[PDB]
Amino acid sequence: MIHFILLFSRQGKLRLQKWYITLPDKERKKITREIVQIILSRGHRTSSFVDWKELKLVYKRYASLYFCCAIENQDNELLTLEIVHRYVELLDKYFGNVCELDIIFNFEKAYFILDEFIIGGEIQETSKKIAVKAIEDSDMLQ
């Protein structure tokens, strides 16, 4: 059960956030600043898992953009990184040669891809053609 997903850049700016656990706003700005301060001060071969407050935090850098998740500490771990990779491929197939600026400008559609891929914490569409077909049909309705 993915608790939350953060998309932050290299500079520390936050490009996306999605909380599947309902903790209040000042706690969000605390948790976000602490996790951005942890991951940006962490080396390149640091095993891509952080045991942060009973949450095996999973991150995977792809560009100046980072990623982040938070699995419950009884579940699979590498599949969370595979979820992150699948989300990158969905962002690529919807946008087409996906960029950093394609997520900064079109973040509302990044949320729509995420909510056509992850709702409630878990994965709703295991395929990578049916999810992009669903979001292209939902935009086809405009």
């Binding site: 290299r10 100046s64 996906v98």
Partner: peptide, 10 residues
């Protein structure tokens, strides 16, 4: 700038 690089190089 470091942003115009694409993500996963398809």
């Amino acid at each position: 700038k470091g942003e115009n690089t694409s993500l996963l190089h398809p």
